[PDB]
Amino acid sequence: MDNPNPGPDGEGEVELEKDSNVVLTTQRDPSTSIPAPVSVKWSRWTSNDVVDDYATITSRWYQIAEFVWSKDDPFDKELARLILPRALLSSIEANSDAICDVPNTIPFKVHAYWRGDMEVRVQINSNKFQVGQLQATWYYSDHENLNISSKRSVYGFSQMDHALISASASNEAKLVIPFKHVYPFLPTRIVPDWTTGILDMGALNIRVIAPLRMSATGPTTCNVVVFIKLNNSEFTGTSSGKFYASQIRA
Amino acid sequence: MDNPNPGPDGEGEVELEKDSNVVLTTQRDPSTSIPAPVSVKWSRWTSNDVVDDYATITSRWYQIAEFVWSKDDPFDKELARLILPRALLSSIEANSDAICDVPNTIPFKVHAYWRGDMEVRVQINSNKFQVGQLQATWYYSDHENLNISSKRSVYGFSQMDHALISASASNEAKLVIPFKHVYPFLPTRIVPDWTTGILDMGALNIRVIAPLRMSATGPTTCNVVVFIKLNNSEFTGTSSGKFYASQIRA
Amino acid sequence: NPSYQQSPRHFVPTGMHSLALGTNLVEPLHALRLDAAGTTQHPVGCAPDED
Amino acid sequence: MTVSSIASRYGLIRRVQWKKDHAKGSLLLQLDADPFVEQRIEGTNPISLYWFAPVGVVSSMFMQWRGSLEYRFDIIASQFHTGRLIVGYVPGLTASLQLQMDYMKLKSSSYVVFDLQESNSFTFEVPYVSYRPWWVRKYGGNYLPSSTDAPSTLFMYVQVPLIPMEAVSDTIDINVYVRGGSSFEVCVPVQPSLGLNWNTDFILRNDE
Amino acid sequence: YVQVPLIPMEAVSDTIDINVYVRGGSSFEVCVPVQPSLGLNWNTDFILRNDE
Amino acid sequence: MTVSSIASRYGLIRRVQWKKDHAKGSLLLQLDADPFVEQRIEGTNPISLYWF
Amino acid sequence: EESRNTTVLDTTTTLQSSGFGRAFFGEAFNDLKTLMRRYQLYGQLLLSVTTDKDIDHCMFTFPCLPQGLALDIGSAGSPHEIFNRCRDGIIPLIASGYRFYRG
Amino acid sequence: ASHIQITRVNNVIELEVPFYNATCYNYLQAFNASSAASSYAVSLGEISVGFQATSDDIASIVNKPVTIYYSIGDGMQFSQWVGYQPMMILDQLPAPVV
Amino acid sequence: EESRNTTVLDTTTTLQSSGFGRAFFGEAFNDLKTLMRRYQLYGQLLLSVTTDKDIDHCMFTFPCLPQGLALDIGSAGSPHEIFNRCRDGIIPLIASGYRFYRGDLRYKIVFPSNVNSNIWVQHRPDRRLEGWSAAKIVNCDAVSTGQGVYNHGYASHIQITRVNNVIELEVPFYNATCYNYLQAFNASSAASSYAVSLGEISVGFQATSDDIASIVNKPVTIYYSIGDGMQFSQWVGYQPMMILDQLPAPVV
Structure with missing residues (x-):
């Protein structure tokens, strides 16, 4: 303890998190926050048709959002209300290319129905001299709740369990997000009983709890990037990809 | 034996062949012909990167060619020189839709390299009173052999092992096609050392050994359809689908 | 659903429990208490000195 | 008497004709993959009667159903008839996507090829694919909202067109029978969406 | 109160935020149930009973 | 669901600013020591909502 | 025959049995007999005295059968809305x- | 009885x-x-319901509803199976029309 | 994280547990589920016949959910004072x-x-x-x-x-x-x-229209409670409250 000896290597240890063929690193301990106990598989109750998780490609980390967080942002200021199963697709399509192009998301192009736990890391690179604090909060099926527009504020997400991202520590926020929804499976396209609100489990949202503060000549911006593993998933109901429609623009 | 008793059911037994979520039937015994002993897996020698067969979707039966076979066709007359890994893709694209649409072929949209045994059934529905006989012959890397244009005739494929499809019996021709190629893996797109001749193991070809013969007022046409399982496969080298190019028109 | 065909008890209604009686006699009530087994209790320093 | 003892009885529900000159792409039927499969009678009545499979009546009494159906197909033909037909199943088709179908899009999802030659009958067993552990009734007591449409759709395209001898008929009948599958099961009891034909009188409440 | 005033470096901010979170303690406990003194914001309509 | 399982969850209830130029005596807050600690929303409503 | 099944073409992987809602709602709906015992509206009427009835006269009489009474929509002017x-x-x-x- | x-x-x-x-x-x-x-x-x-009212009191009874219910009573046992006669779908019945 | 507690600065000597009134009033209020089952006013109405109703017509119909009906203060002239x-x-x-x-x-x-x-x-x-x-x-x-x-x-x-x-x-x-x-x-x-x-429960009288006149504008209060088997799931923080004692006076 208390015996620094930086070398060419630098000082601290670097913890990893390999999945399929994607390794990614964080110098800091993740501030994990797990809204629910891990989901039961549930293919048993609602699918004769062939079911298969694609662990070797669906479980890879893949970016879904990135954003500057300048000092100009006022105390309570959303940076990103990401939907999650959708943003994984909506961001790709927003980046002007089809879902089929990206290995993580090809099974969505085909299978009619999805289920499964998600993982979301909200990595940041604030400088050590900056002062601020994001919160990252997952809120299940937000869109279904019409009064959410009033709840959607840092006072209101701090009550449910939520990750904290201090800009001083440049802390990285892990966020396990086990499946919970009124219906056991989320459709990946228009489906006979619903159309609107497709593949929408709920929403990650990253409200600011403390705006960046810095010396007048200090570093203004603080970029953030959000990877999303899609691990214990399972897909069911094989179907042609021509039925698939591009995700709502958001 | 020798005791027919047809009912509403009809007479004979119906043997099946389920795979993933595709069952298909043949009243008759398949005339299997297996060119090579089953392939060793070979991901060991040429792929650090994550490898995964997609048994739950790649192994499904899916049509790749269908063709009328009228009495007008002369003795030695090709009906279809199908390439196989390509025709599985080339037919889909020929049918005016992208590879991503079809569940069997999505992993090709992504993974740079393919390997693995194929299965090909050449089902037919000739009437019992028709007289004729297709041969179905698999010929490894045909395109590499320039003199093949002379070999490509029924006298020349009957020497290597080949399926026979009598039109009298309306026999169905099974055809296991284990991987063999000079290079252990077949690329699914332009690759640094080769471009032309992409994903081309060789060619199935269905020369006629005996033209249909029938009474002048009998049934002229005899349709044929060719399903292709892609079983003990394995894919390697994950890569973006935007690199993929539509298969050569053939 | 077996049917229960045998004759019912034959009781006589009265509007009210006895006002006079006040000893060896359980007296049913619509408690405004939450718990139905609850009853007032005396913490050790609140004990009733006077009998 | 039991919901399963009634569900496990075929009733003829559709009668496809199948002519020689149907090309390889031709549709024969696309009845919905819910018990409420239908066959209207061409009656003179203002309110037309409908045939149902026994599963289609016993399941109208219940709000919700789940599990496999079974469509037996009696392809009525002499052994000298020969042909082949797909009997596919597409999960998650909304009615706007009900069109744009063809057998080749069908092959992408679950399906079953069959070879009419000697044996002339089979029994495709329709899968229950939906996001909902049960599934709500297609119809309802006379109340149009709360009438969810079917989970998925059956299809039966002709994979290889029929090839009859000159001395046998150009056309083959195909009977489609429906039966509650081994796992077919229903839960909540509500108003039947069906009424008996014992009295088909009805009285409009026009205010005029 | 601030027992010893904050002493920032020139290269870091003059101001520090302080969040105050409240939680029922280990021994926090409540007894008698009565009318909530709070109403949901699901409907904030209210109607004065002026007699005029 | 339990009174204690709900009571044992923090919710942000106050956000003090803390500037360098606060002298040693300066007050930052004096919220009451009862659960009903408060943070009014600056809404336009005739009857203002409060966080709890 | 009717219930014969010549050649099943199974595609389904086995689905979990629910026991007819026993595994969810806590009550089987398998036996249709036990549903038969939920009560149903059988008939309906507006009493209509005609003759000057004595103490003994029956006000109305109906046959009692499981089949259900012949359905009575009522007159076109005054439908019994439920059977209608x-x-x-x-x-x-x-x-x-x-x-x-x-x- | x-x-x-x-x-x-x-x-x-x-x-x-x-x-x-x-x-x-x-x-x-x-x-x-x-x-x-x-x-x-x-x-x-062939059940018969009847009031014991004298005609002077019977006037109160006129056009008062008397709904009836029934259920098969446990001991019931239907026998031979017979297929359903054609149904008539209810949601397809005509609207009152304003 | 939300429930983390970095460094407790204890000053308290331990306070006696009361068991949520178990030690005083003789009844625990710990489980909030058992309080959920005390009955609550759910809706309220004055019956209003419009059309000449038959024996079969439902008098009123309401959806039945734990969330509570959307709050009905009533019209500005005639408030339902309790929800108001x-x-x-x-x-x-x-x-x-x-x-x-x-x-x-x-x-x-x-x-x-x-x-x-x-x-x-x-x-x-x-x-x-x-x-x-x-x-x-x-x-x-x-x-x-x-x-x-x-x-x-x-x-x-x-x-x-x-x-x-x-x-x-x-x-x-x-x-x-x-x-x-x-x-x-x-x-x-x-x-x-x-x-x-x-x-979607539906209540309906069997009265003929001649007798239905007695029923008009007669109150029908409704109650509800969560019924033992109820089990709410995912925690979600409270939306902003509105303190009740701070509501405006009628003003004389």
Whole structure:
């Protein structure tokens, strides 16, 4: 303890998190926050048709959002209300290319129905001299709740369990997000009983709890990037990809 | 034996062949012909990167060619020189839709390299009173052999092992096609050392050994359809689908 | 659903429990208490000195 | 008497004709993959009667159903008839996507090829694919909202067109029978969406 | 109160935020149930009973 | 669901600013020591909502 | 034959049995007999004195059968809306399915 | 066999119509009466409800509703299977039209 | 994280546990579920005949959900003073705190005394709630669908008002869902609409129109409680409250 000896290597240890063929690193301990106990598989109750998780490609980390967080942002200021199963697709399509192009998301192009736990890391690179604090909060099926527009504020997400991202520590926020929804499976396209609100489990949202503060000549911006593993998933109901429609623009 | 008793059911037994979520039937015994002993897996020698067969979707039966076979066709007359890994893709694209649409072929949209045994059934529905006989012959890397244009005739494929499809019996021709190629893996797109001749193991070809013969007022046409399982496969080298190019028109 | 065909008890209604009686006699009530087994209790320093 | 003892009885529900000159792409039927499969009678009545499979009546009494159906197909033909037909199943088709179908899009999802030659009958067993552990009734007591449409759709395209001898008929009948599958099961009891034909009188409440 | 005033470096901010979170303690406990003194914001309509 | 399982969850209830130029005596807050600690929303409503 | 099944073309992987809602709602709906015992509207009327009735006269008489009474929509001017709208019912609908009863 | 509800105490008499017929088991579909003795082969009986009011009091009773219920009573056992006659879908019935 | 506690600065000597009033009043208030079962006012109405109703017509129909009906202050001229004043309640206030539920409800409707007429009560699991608007008691008008009338299959019960004028109920959980929505509901998915209400209860008198005049503008209060089997799921923080003692005075 208390015996620094930086070398060419630098000082601290670097913890990893390999999945399929994607390794990614964080110098800091993740501030994990797990809204629910891990989901039961549930293919048993609602699918004769062939079911298969694609662990070797669906479980890879893949970016879904990135954003500057300048000092100009006022105390309570959303940076990103990401939907999650959708943003994984909506961001790709927003980046002007089809879902089929990206290995993580090809099974969505085909299978009619999805289920499964998600993982979301909200990595940041604030400088050590900056002062601020994001919160990252997952809120299940937000869109279904019409009064959410009033709840959607840092006072209101701090009550449910939520990750904290201090800009001083440049802390990285892990966020396990086990499946919970009124219906056991989320459709990946228009489906006979619903159309609107497709593949929408709920929403990650990253409200600011403390705006960046810095010396007048200090570093203004603080970029953030959000990877999303899609691990214990399972897909069911094989179907042609021509039925698939591009995700709502958001 | 020798005791027919047809009912509403009809007479004979119906043997099946389920795979993933595709069952298909043949009243008759398949005339299997297996060119090579089953392939060793070979991901060991040429792929650090994550490898995964997609048994739950790649192994499904899916049509790749269908063709009328009228009495007008002369003795030695090709009906279809199908390439196989390509025709599985080339037919889909020929049918005016992208590879991503079809569940069997999505992993090709992504993974740079393919390997693995194929299965090909050449089902037919000739009437019992028709007289004729297709041969179905698999010929490894045909395109590499320039003199093949002379070999490509029924006298020349009957020497290597080949399926026979009598039109009298309306026999169905099974055809296991284990991987063999000079290079252990077949690329699914332009690759640094080769471009032309992409994903081309060789060619199935269905020369006629005996033209249909029938009474002048009998049934002229005899349709044929060719399903292709892609079983003990394995894919390697994950890569973006935007690199993929539509298969050569053939 | 077996049917229960045998004759019912034959009781006589009265509007009210006895006002006079006040000893060896359980007296049913619509408690405004939450718990139905609850009853007032005396913490050790609140004990009733006077009998 | 039991919901399963009634569900496990075929009733003829559709009668496809199948002519020689149907090309390889031709549709024969696309009845919905819910018990409420239908066959209207061409009656003179203002309110037309409908045939149902026994599963289609016993399941109208219940709000919700789940599990496999079974469509037996009696392809009525002499052994000298020969042909082949797909009997596919597409999960998650909304009615706007009900069109744009063809057998080749069908092959992408679950399906079953069959070879009419000697044996002339089979029994495709329709899968229950939906996001909902049960599934709500297609119809309802006379109340149009709360009438969810079917989970998925059956299809039966002709994979290889029929090839009859000159001395046998150009056309083959195909009977489609429906039966509650081994796992077919229903839960909540509500108003039947069906009424008996014992009295088909009805009285409009026009205010005029 | 601030027992010893904050002493920032020139290269870091003059101001520090302080969040105050409240939680029922280990021994926090409540007894008698009565009318909530709070109403949901699901409907904030209210109607004065002026007699005029 | 339990009174204690709900009571044992923090919710942000106050956000003090803390500037360098606060002298040693300066007050930052004096919220009451009862659960009903408060943070009014600056809404336009005739009857203002409060966080709890 | 009717219930014969010549050649099953199974595609399904086995689905979990729910026991007819026993595994969810806590109550089996398998036996249709136990549903038959939920009560149903059978008939309906507005009493209509005609003759000057004595103490003994029956006010109305109806046959009592499982089949259900012949459905009475009522006159075109004054429909009994339930039979007009909610046609028949459950018990008659299942009585439709059998040819003899004894109970 | 009979029973007499006192409307003042509780106005819903509950019953148990029993099976009294000299038959194996009764007809269950609609009935057109072929045999003259087939007519005993349907109804369990023929219930009759009647008020004991004198005509002076019977005026209160006029056009007062009397709904009736029924259920098959545990001992019921339908026999031979017979397929359903054509149904008529209910949601397809005509609207009142404004 | 939310419930983390970095460095406790204890000053307290340990306080005696009271067991939530168990040590005083003789009854624990620890479990909030057992308080949830004290009955609450759910809705309220003055019956309003419009069309000349027959024996079969439902008098009113309301969706039955734990969340509580959308609050009905009433018209500015004629407020329902309790919801106007005693905003919402307990059970909806705790329903505010969770995002899913899966369970029964109980009701115990209290009909007007002066009326004698028999009263039937349908439960209708089929019905979808259609957005938070029209999640309220509805006075059904002229029959046009099957919504307005008694129905055969639906579970039902028929109180005799003359014997005791408060039918008590047990609305069960019939949905093809894991568990229903519990906050306010705007209906995103069309199939999300089956994911809220337990059903859609309908109360209806069997009175002929000649007798229905006695019934007009007679109160019918309704109660509810979560029915033992209820189990709210995911925690979700409270939306902003509005303190009640701070509500405006009538002003003389």
